[PDB]
Amino acid sequence: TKFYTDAVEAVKDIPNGATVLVGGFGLCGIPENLIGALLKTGVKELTAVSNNAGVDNFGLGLLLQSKQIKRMISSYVGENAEFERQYLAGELEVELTPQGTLAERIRAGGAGVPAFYTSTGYGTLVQEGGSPIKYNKDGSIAIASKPREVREFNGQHFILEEAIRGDFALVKAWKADQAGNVTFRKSARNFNLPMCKAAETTVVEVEEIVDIGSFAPEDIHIPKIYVHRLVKGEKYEKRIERLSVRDNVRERIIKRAALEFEDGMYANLGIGIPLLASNFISPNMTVHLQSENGILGLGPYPLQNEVDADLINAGKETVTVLPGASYFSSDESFAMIRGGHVNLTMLGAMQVSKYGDLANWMKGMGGAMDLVSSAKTKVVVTMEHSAKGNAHKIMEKCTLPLTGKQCVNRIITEKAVFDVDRKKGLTLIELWEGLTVDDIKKSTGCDFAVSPKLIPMQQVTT
Amino acid sequence: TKFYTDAVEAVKDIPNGATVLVGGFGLCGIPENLIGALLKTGVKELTAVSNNAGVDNFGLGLLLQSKQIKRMISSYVGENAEFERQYLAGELEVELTPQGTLAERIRAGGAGVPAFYTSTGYGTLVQEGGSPIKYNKDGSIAIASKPREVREFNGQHFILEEAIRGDFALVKAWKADQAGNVTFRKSARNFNLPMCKAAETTVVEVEEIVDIGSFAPEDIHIPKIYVHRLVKGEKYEKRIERLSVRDNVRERIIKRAALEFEDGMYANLGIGIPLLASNFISPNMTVHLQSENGILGLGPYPLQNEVDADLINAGKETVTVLPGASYFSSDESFAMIRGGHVNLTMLGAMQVSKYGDLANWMVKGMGGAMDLVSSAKTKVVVTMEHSAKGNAHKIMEKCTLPLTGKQCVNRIITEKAVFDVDRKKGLTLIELWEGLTVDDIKKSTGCDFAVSPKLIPMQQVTT
Amino acid sequence: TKFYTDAVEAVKDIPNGATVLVGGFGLCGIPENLIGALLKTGVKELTAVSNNAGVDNFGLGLLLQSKQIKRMISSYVGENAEFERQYLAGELEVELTPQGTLAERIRAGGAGVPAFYTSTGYGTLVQEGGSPIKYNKDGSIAIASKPREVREFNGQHFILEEAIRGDFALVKAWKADQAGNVTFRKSARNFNLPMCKAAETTVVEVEEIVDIGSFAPEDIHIPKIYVHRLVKGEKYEKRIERLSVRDNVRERIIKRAALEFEDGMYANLGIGIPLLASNFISPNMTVHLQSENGILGLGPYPLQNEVDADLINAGKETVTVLPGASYFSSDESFAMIRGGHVNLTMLGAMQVSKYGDLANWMVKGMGGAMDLVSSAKTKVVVTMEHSAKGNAHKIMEKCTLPLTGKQCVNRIITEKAVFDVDRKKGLTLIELWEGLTVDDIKKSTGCDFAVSPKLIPMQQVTT
Amino acid sequence: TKFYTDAVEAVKDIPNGATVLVGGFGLCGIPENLIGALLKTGVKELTAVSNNAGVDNFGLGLLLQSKQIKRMISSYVGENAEFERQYLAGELEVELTPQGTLAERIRAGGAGVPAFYTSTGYGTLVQEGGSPIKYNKDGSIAIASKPREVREFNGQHFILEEAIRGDFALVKAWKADQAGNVTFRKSARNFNLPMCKAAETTVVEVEEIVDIGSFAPEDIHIPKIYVHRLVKGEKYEKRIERLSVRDNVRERIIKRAALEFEDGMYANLGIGIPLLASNFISPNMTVHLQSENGILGLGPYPLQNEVDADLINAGKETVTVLPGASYFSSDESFAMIRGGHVNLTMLGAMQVSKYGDLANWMKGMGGAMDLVSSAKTKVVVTMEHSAKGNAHKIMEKCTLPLTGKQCVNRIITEKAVFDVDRKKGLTLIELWEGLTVDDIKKSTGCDFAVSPKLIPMQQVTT
Ligand SMILES: [K+]
Ligand SMILES: [K+]
Ligand SMILES: [K+]
Ligand SMILES: [K+]
Ligand SMILES: [K+]
Ligand SMILES: [K+]
């Protein structure tokens, strides 16, 4: 590892056009000083591989403001108006790739794996191609995404994704010892860890340099072999994107969603109703919440003194963890998710089809496509029954872009609870008292079986 | 995580015929108590996915001795005569898979990836198929390995390997906290870590159970989500397979090999000459030695009282590590190796071809040799005696022995010469042992070679 | 042999899902009446082993049109849009197998040989696996071909291919005597002959039934032992797929290709330039042209009134044969080819590599191209325009198109140069089109090449 | 094709040590003139690939007398005392290879196939190796055969055999036209046909040269491309090795064996009882007899005027064929046999095991190992029940060299008829009247089931 006292020195040789991997999930674990250094070098036309686009004036957004990025390869680019403007104007190219796929393609890039298969994105536009990566000033499409090759293994369909390697990686880390060994703090690890292994030259900025021997050998997150250039970041603003401190239809969904929790369950909860539902878990029940940016054991929002820029949830809110929590990188998080280790994945949806196709993302798909990619994880959708104008949200076929095909196992609305089966379709198993099966018929766009043991819709006791 | 006080209770439901992942590299990090529990349950016909076969009376060898294994899926199975015996007799099935491929297939299996590509094994018997996985009693081949599918990416060839998942995994770990979070000690991590994610039911035995909060959250090697059953092992023998404590032709190779080292270099040294050469590294030079069983920063053999069963090198010798060393799992180790992060890989060879094909492994298995030379980014340097007994060529047009890799050697160091090897142009004699002539080399080499315009007498490290 | 007066009676017991071998090369020697009988029985989901797919409305194309075929195992399936349509739509499965391998696998299937080795397909997608045999409606790959196992014999690589056997074979023959002995006419023999031995129940339709004793015993092509069911075909359309009756860059290649011919030579000429070159053979020179569909002694295209549906060349063109010609079956033809008995094989190429890899076939299938260059004993001469549109290199370090063969080309003839090709040393420019310079060739060739010390202006046949 | 007027001219360049393929089955279709020419050139140390060793003073035996052969690769070398003497004395090397395997290895050699699998020889010394190929003068072994690799396919075991290619082939043919196209007459085709394709230089001698155009193109047995050198043989002796012109225990076996015949059956009959049994086939029944030297449709022994050196059966007897007979080469004959196209193969045996192993060959195995190699062909053994001294011939395990393993389906003796099953063993289905099941018990060396429908042993009506 080569140590630098000046960040510009550490990155001055990045060529125009370089593919640069930039760590960070939201504003968590971003290499703010290395990004500050690129503003000074003025290198341009970069293809930035960055999970997110920071915010308008921070993180990757600073490089978008200065127009130093030709293309971004990211999974979620919301919360950044300059980004949106450039994209629509045809000034910026954008390849949206599922978050877990982005993590794994980066990991493959550092592991000598040119390509691998993942179900994430199967049946969606990731597979189908056709998304505008780049527009012409006239508003037409200049570059459309390529469809992905898909192959069946063990009766399931998987898309072939290729490794992502960078010319450079700009990595934010916590500490580096004098040998160049590096560790990451809390959830700031995310993509920084795998990105450190996937570029020809990795540049890491750390908050502190410690003596060789400060780390237990077993606990070095990134061995020095991956750290080519190391600089102690000069300034850390610790920006927090969203400071989060500790109707009846919605309340009803929350209260029935709260009943999906089981003792010992591992769950991943999308923001909104699913997350609110966790507030009703019995202190008697032990439920472990997984966060896809690399956390297992999420706790409630922090009391003001617990607020930590390094600890946010997938919705980018400041959060806390419970005793016995663990942190891990983004590739490891999605290995955990894709491998079906989470028992329950509960999320909101705009539409769900008869056989469980889900439309809930189209800013980018973030980790939603990965979260529903495994048949081993029970996917529970919580959403209001019908859309504005009473248009069906549950129907034969989604009309909105799919997040996944035949991946929903249960739908919870304020009116009903449907179990969903990829081959047989819907089964009404709970019914809000006061409504009748025919009321459901009228608000649902496809047929459904009625369970012989249909009960009034339950509501958690709390 | 469910805690058990009895190991048999933790594994009694394993079915006959189950595929069981068993952690451990050699005797390092083996789940000796869970294995002991399987001897009691008597479950049989297991397909054991285990990097190695332990030794005759320990680790997986115990289950082979009791005949509870139908098939082993391993990368290296030497040091076991009952294994050898059962294999040749047609009583045991064996699929040899490159060590790094095994680690990655297991990882894939826990990560939802059904298959991936790797250059490891391309152009070898792994790709080619035809190795006997199983013999019949009369010596006929009952099952031959399947060839692997090939695909080209970015101008190179890779083979398609599929995930490995087990019904159960028997994992050895260091400590578990009360929530089921687990950590591994030193090099005992190896395959235990990835195997914990790749089975329907993971059973972990640990040396000690500690309070929730004993681990820093960032430093939990295996989050509790992957630990289904946990037991504190009742007995730990701390078996050490090889207790390693601190001619001229060979010495010459060693001394020229020592000159391949450069300050700041990351190197992986095979046992024998390569490793011996590291003893001549200048205390002025900083060289980081990587061990494929998951270590970066290997040090010299320990004094006797420093020996640690949890710390061994790839040759299964007890070792030490230097300040700033790190440990990591087998899949990570081979990601590091396959990704080309090691600058120099120096190993022994039986044969090397004109364009750099290497034969240096063949039934004991290829271990990590095929992975070690799988990347074009790592410089591969072979150190071997020039010619075989009877002066048969070892360096020639084509290897006649099973390949470890195709066009992967960049340099050959023998007691007579040093050849740089290029996949397109072939051999270039760049150093010549003084007293020998270019014609002497011609006579001991089985293919043509260019003679560098800057050919020098063969160098020898100063030490 | 059991005689039938009704074709439907002869095939009514074929089960849905049966594997059925169907004779014929193009529309030559196809069992049109048995196929017509299958349209009436309606049997479905057949795995049809048929060299070709007939044409849209004839031969196997009729069964594709009625959707009675689940999978085709063929070597060449061009000239059929319903086939193409069903394949891409995921309605039809297709395993492309080299023509000669198909013939030999079928023969093996009737000879009790479960598997054999052939160099045909080594280093290509046949060995490598991964071709889509079947797509799903959304375009995903439902079934990918399996790679083939490799083995080395006498220093060369071969792949292991397995026998093909059918439940039934639908065979077209010329005459059967009353005992069930059968003969084939001209080139209509092709696959019909070997397919008669490789199915549990063989059904043969013939044009005429003659008295026992009409055949000389030595001249029965298929002994009655292989003929289980026999029917005199009710109707024979004598369909002819291609009625063939007797620039300067291209002309230059042709005229230099014509100089590859030698008196007494056995040659196999691919359609296009190679075949055109044969028109310049001196009536003084005797050259015997072999056709892989089973002919030795091809002659010029016939006058219109000499056209015979039973006599076509490999490009499916109607032809004639010269005095002393012979006909033989497809397995025999490829034994002849694979055995290296043809002295010169001249074909077109899309790309040729420095060491002689050839890309000249790729989904229509590789036909006999992979077999044609499979032998080191046959000189393989490629005739192609030097560079592709946009001047992209066609001759280069490595082909970027699917290989037909590895290191199998011995010479390249373009409108600018003639290169001898050596598998170990590469290219040697031996002739140069006058007016061009060695540097001009450098600019249009994607790899280095030696310049012969005896380089001459490119020759042109006198005619 | 190059035509020669002098045979010596056609073969003078054969090197000492050359591997030479010599056509012929017994004395049928031997290249007598080319062999005469080798006597004059004196080339030595040849490895002669020849199905048989001719007889003492003819065919290959002439080359053995002159000591010009170092090694023979043959399937049957009986009827030649000089051969036997040299072999035992250690002067001649001998590799016995099953006839059908020899044919197929030669064919593979001309077809570009380096190796193939065949069940022929599985479970026998062909697989096991250990046969002396060469003795030392002291009577010990100098060279022992190598075991063959065996691999399972579709649940069956097959041995890997490698191609045989020659430096030269000496081929006897009937006619050649002026272009070099060649045809073979009757059963003289045998190995000459495949040998013409498997050597670097093929030399063919023919009885007559005819005009181009004499052969129908479809009926050229060997296209000119395979005929490198052609000579019209100067002399043809038409030697006939065995001139064959048209007790009660043995008679009983014959009469019960005659009942194995069925209308429309294809059968291959070994010499002795099986062949004698065919004399009792009803003129009402149509049975087609296959001869492994390349004939289908064998008829009775010839009346003196029908005697033809070109037409002999597998026992090398002069024979005739019936209307509608066909001739074919040795590789094609064994493809027919190995592929299981013959319905019934009836042969004599020295021993048969409980599960159907057969010992009936140890001169060489000839085609016996191939004849029983297919599970599709019913193998019926006809033999006297017990050996001299009443030793068991039917027992648990044969003690004599195996011809095949689990390949016998029925055993016919003068006392009993046993069906044989590879998994269940023996089932006594017929019993010679006057004998009891216990009498069979006493004469049989293993247990056997007694059919519930056991009948007195049948005897053909004729
Ligand atoms: K699911
Ligand atoms: K390398
Ligand atoms: K390589
Ligand atoms: K060639
Ligand atoms: K080749
Ligand atoms: K049988």
PDB file of C-alpha atoms in Angstrom, chain C residues 1 104 107 110-119 149 151 153-154 158 160 162 165 174 177 179 181 184-186 189 197 200 212-213 217-221 223-226 266 288 296 323-328 331-332 334-336 338-339 341-342 377, chain D residues 1 104 107 110-119 149 151 153-154 158 160 162 165 174 177 179 181 184-186 189 197 200 212-213 217-221 223-226 266 288 296 323-328 331-332 334-336 338-339 341-342 376:
ATOM      1  CA  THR C   1     -39.252 -58.961 -43.164  1.00  0.00           C
ATOM      2  CA  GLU C 104     -21.071 -42.704 -37.037  1.00  0.00           C
ATOM      3  CA  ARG C 107     -23.787 -46.718 -37.129  1.00  0.00           C
ATOM      4  CA  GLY C 110     -26.678 -50.444 -34.875  1.00  0.00           C
ATOM      5  CA  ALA C 111     -23.289 -52.061 -34.261  1.00  0.00           C
ATOM      6  CA  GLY C 112     -23.353 -52.463 -30.496  1.00  0.00           C
ATOM      7  CA  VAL C 113     -20.792 -49.696 -29.942  1.00  0.00           C
ATOM      8  CA  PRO C 114     -22.008 -47.356 -27.212  1.00  0.00           C
ATOM      9  CA  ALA C 115     -19.461 -44.711 -27.842  1.00  0.00           C
ATOM     10  CA  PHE C 116     -16.390 -43.879 -29.868  1.00  0.00           C
ATOM     11  CA  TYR C 117     -13.957 -41.052 -30.354  1.00  0.00           C
ATOM     12  CA  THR C 118     -13.653 -38.638 -33.256  1.00  0.00           C
ATOM     13  CA  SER C 119     -11.648 -35.490 -33.763  1.00  0.00           C
ATOM     14  CA  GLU C 149     -15.707 -35.352 -23.005  1.00  0.00           C
ATOM     15  CA  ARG C 151      -9.470 -37.731 -24.621  1.00  0.00           C
ATOM     16  CA  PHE C 153      -4.865 -40.656 -28.308  1.00  0.00           C
ATOM     17  CA  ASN C 154      -1.540 -40.810 -30.077  1.00  0.00           C
ATOM     18  CA  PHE C 158     -10.747 -36.538 -29.707  1.00  0.00           C
ATOM     19  CA  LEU C 160     -16.292 -38.989 -27.061  1.00  0.00           C
ATOM     20  CA  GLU C 162     -22.336 -41.752 -28.040  1.00  0.00           C
ATOM     21  CA  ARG C 165     -30.429 -45.663 -31.634  1.00  0.00           C
ATOM     22  CA  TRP C 174     -34.681 -48.200 -54.236  1.00  0.00           C
ATOM     23  CA  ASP C 177     -36.504 -58.268 -53.133  1.00  0.00           C
ATOM     24  CA  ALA C 179     -36.992 -61.709 -48.948  1.00  0.00           C
ATOM     25  CA  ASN C 181     -33.100 -57.452 -48.994  1.00  0.00           C
ATOM     26  CA  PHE C 184     -30.301 -47.883 -52.623  1.00  0.00           C
ATOM     27  CA  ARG C 185     -29.948 -45.835 -55.746  1.00  0.00           C
ATOM     28  CA  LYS C 186     -27.097 -43.475 -56.456  1.00  0.00           C
ATOM     29  CA  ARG C 189     -28.344 -44.110 -50.045  1.00  0.00           C
ATOM     30  CA  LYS C 197     -29.458 -50.919 -38.499  1.00  0.00           C
ATOM     31  CA  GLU C 200     -35.659 -51.371 -32.917  1.00  0.00           C
ATOM     32  CA  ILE C 212     -35.711 -63.079 -54.684  1.00  0.00           C
ATOM     33  CA  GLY C 213     -32.603 -63.658 -56.776  1.00  0.00           C
ATOM     34  CA  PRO C 217     -25.877 -61.661 -53.059  1.00  0.00           C
ATOM     35  CA  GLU C 218     -22.696 -59.575 -52.900  1.00  0.00           C
ATOM     36  CA  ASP C 219     -24.636 -56.527 -53.922  1.00  0.00           C
ATOM     37  CA  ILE C 220     -27.399 -56.321 -51.393  1.00  0.00           C
ATOM     38  CA  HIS C 221     -26.841 -52.989 -49.663  1.00  0.00           C
ATOM     39  CA  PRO C 223     -29.477 -57.518 -45.831  1.00  0.00           C
ATOM     40  CA  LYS C 224     -33.061 -58.435 -44.923  1.00  0.00           C
ATOM     41  CA  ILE C 225     -32.031 -58.971 -41.278  1.00  0.00           C
ATOM     42  CA  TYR C 226     -32.179 -55.192 -40.885  1.00  0.00           C
ATOM     43  CA  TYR C 266      -8.956 -37.208 -54.384  1.00  0.00           C
ATOM     44  CA  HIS C 288     -11.700 -37.522 -58.292  1.00  0.00           C
ATOM     45  CA  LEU C 296     -16.885 -40.557 -55.302  1.00  0.00           C
ATOM     46  CA  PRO C 323     -17.114 -43.079 -65.403  1.00  0.00           C
ATOM     47  CA  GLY C 324     -15.904 -45.310 -62.558  1.00  0.00           C
ATOM     48  CA  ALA C 325     -17.773 -43.405 -59.857  1.00  0.00           C
ATOM     49  CA  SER C 326     -19.092 -45.149 -56.782  1.00  0.00           C
ATOM     50  CA  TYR C 327     -21.797 -44.494 -54.245  1.00  0.00           C
ATOM     51  CA  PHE C 328     -21.643 -45.312 -50.588  1.00  0.00           C
ATOM     52  CA  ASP C 331     -21.190 -43.480 -42.397  1.00  0.00           C
ATOM     53  CA  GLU C 332     -18.910 -44.860 -45.042  1.00  0.00           C
ATOM     54  CA  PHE C 334     -17.401 -39.955 -43.242  1.00  0.00           C
ATOM     55  CA  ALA C 335     -15.197 -42.940 -42.447  1.00  0.00           C
ATOM     56  CA  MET C 336     -13.538 -42.079 -45.757  1.00  0.00           C
ATOM     57  CA  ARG C 338     -12.406 -38.770 -41.083  1.00  0.00           C
ATOM     58  CA  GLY C 339      -9.890 -41.503 -41.987  1.00  0.00           C
ATOM     59  CA  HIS C 341      -8.532 -40.649 -47.407  1.00  0.00           C
ATOM     60  CA  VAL C 342      -9.406 -37.437 -49.302  1.00  0.00           C
ATOM     61  CA  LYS C 377      -3.906 -36.359 -43.216  1.00  0.00           C
TER      62      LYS C 377
ATOM     63  CA  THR D   1      -4.614 -46.547 -58.102  1.00  0.00           C
ATOM     64  CA  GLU D 104     -13.932 -53.090 -35.716  1.00  0.00           C
ATOM     65  CA  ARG D 107     -12.377 -50.403 -39.407  1.00  0.00           C
ATOM     66  CA  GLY D 110      -9.459 -46.547 -41.511  1.00  0.00           C
ATOM     67  CA  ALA D 111     -12.269 -44.313 -40.302  1.00  0.00           C
ATOM     68  CA  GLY D 112     -10.396 -41.860 -38.119  1.00  0.00           C
ATOM     69  CA  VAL D 113     -11.713 -43.389 -34.879  1.00  0.00           C
ATOM     70  CA  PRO D 114      -8.875 -43.919 -32.437  1.00  0.00           C
ATOM     71  CA  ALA D 115     -10.901 -46.002 -30.032  1.00  0.00           C
ATOM     72  CA  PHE D 116     -14.373 -47.289 -29.344  1.00  0.00           C
ATOM     73  CA  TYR D 117     -16.161 -49.415 -26.781  1.00  0.00           C
ATOM     74  CA  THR D 118     -17.496 -52.930 -27.187  1.00  0.00           C
ATOM     75  CA  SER D 119     -18.881 -55.404 -24.663  1.00  0.00           C
ATOM     76  CA  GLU D 149      -9.907 -50.331 -19.743  1.00  0.00           C
ATOM     77  CA  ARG D 151     -16.305 -48.235 -18.730  1.00  0.00           C
ATOM     78  CA  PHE D 153     -22.553 -46.970 -20.503  1.00  0.00           C
ATOM     79  CA  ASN D 154     -26.291 -47.289 -20.013  1.00  0.00           C
ATOM     80  CA  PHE D 158     -17.702 -52.146 -22.268  1.00  0.00           C
ATOM     81  CA  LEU D 160     -12.142 -49.711 -24.734  1.00  0.00           C
ATOM     82  CA  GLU D 162      -8.076 -49.020 -29.960  1.00  0.00           C
ATOM     83  CA  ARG D 165      -3.779 -49.242 -38.649  1.00  0.00           C
ATOM     84  CA  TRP D 174     -12.313 -60.597 -56.935  1.00  0.00           C
ATOM     85  CA  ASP D 177     -11.942 -52.172 -62.807  1.00  0.00           C
ATOM     86  CA  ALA D 179      -9.963 -47.133 -62.210  1.00  0.00           C
ATOM     87  CA  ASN D 181     -12.598 -49.946 -57.930  1.00  0.00           C
ATOM     88  CA  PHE D 184     -15.148 -59.196 -53.470  1.00  0.00           C
ATOM     89  CA  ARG D 185     -16.733 -62.534 -54.172  1.00  0.00           C
ATOM     90  CA  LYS D 186     -19.005 -64.351 -51.831  1.00  0.00           C
ATOM     91  CA  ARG D 189     -14.766 -60.485 -48.663  1.00  0.00           C
ATOM     92  CA  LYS D 197      -9.084 -48.751 -45.597  1.00  0.00           C
ATOM     93  CA  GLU D 200      -1.024 -46.283 -45.363  1.00  0.00           C
ATOM     94  CA  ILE D 212     -14.206 -48.987 -66.099  1.00  0.00           C
ATOM     95  CA  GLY D 213     -17.973 -49.186 -66.227  1.00  0.00           C
ATOM     96  CA  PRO D 217     -21.473 -47.449 -59.168  1.00  0.00           C
ATOM     97  CA  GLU D 218     -23.663 -48.522 -56.248  1.00  0.00           C
ATOM     98  CA  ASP D 219     -22.027 -51.903 -56.223  1.00  0.00           C
ATOM     99  CA  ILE D 220     -18.356 -51.154 -55.916  1.00  0.00           C
ATOM    100  CA  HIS D 221     -17.364 -52.823 -52.614  1.00  0.00           C
ATOM    101  CA  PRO D 223     -13.960 -47.474 -54.039  1.00  0.00           C
ATOM    102  CA  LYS D 224     -10.633 -46.814 -55.785  1.00  0.00           C
ATOM    103  CA  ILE D 225      -9.724 -44.162 -53.217  1.00  0.00           C
ATOM    104  CA  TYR D 226      -8.764 -47.050 -50.940  1.00  0.00           C
ATOM    105  CA  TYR D 266     -32.081 -65.068 -37.626  1.00  0.00           C
ATOM    106  CA  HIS D 288     -31.895 -67.492 -41.732  1.00  0.00           C
ATOM    107  CA  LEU D 296     -26.509 -64.243 -44.193  1.00  0.00           C
ATOM    108  CA  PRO D 323     -31.904 -67.889 -52.282  1.00  0.00           C
ATOM    109  CA  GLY D 324     -31.853 -64.321 -51.040  1.00  0.00           C
ATOM    110  CA  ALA D 325     -28.573 -64.667 -49.178  1.00  0.00           C
ATOM    111  CA  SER D 326     -26.183 -61.727 -48.856  1.00  0.00           C
ATOM    112  CA  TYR D 327     -22.466 -61.309 -48.224  1.00  0.00           C
ATOM    113  CA  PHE D 328     -20.811 -58.528 -46.269  1.00  0.00           C
ATOM    114  CA  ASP D 331     -16.693 -55.433 -39.668  1.00  0.00           C
ATOM    115  CA  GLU D 332     -20.254 -55.336 -40.979  1.00  0.00           C
ATOM    116  CA  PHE D 334     -19.775 -58.127 -36.289  1.00  0.00           C
ATOM    117  CA  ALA D 335     -21.694 -54.863 -36.299  1.00  0.00           C
ATOM    118  CA  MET D 336     -24.668 -57.125 -37.115  1.00  0.00           C
ATOM    119  CA  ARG D 338     -22.584 -56.963 -31.680  1.00  0.00           C
ATOM    120  CA  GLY D 339     -25.672 -54.847 -32.415  1.00  0.00           C
ATOM    121  CA  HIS D 341     -29.435 -58.311 -34.834  1.00  0.00           C
ATOM    122  CA  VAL D 342     -29.133 -62.089 -34.680  1.00  0.00           C
ATOM    123  CA  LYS D 376     -30.394 -58.610 -27.299  1.00  0.00           C
TER     124      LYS D 376
END
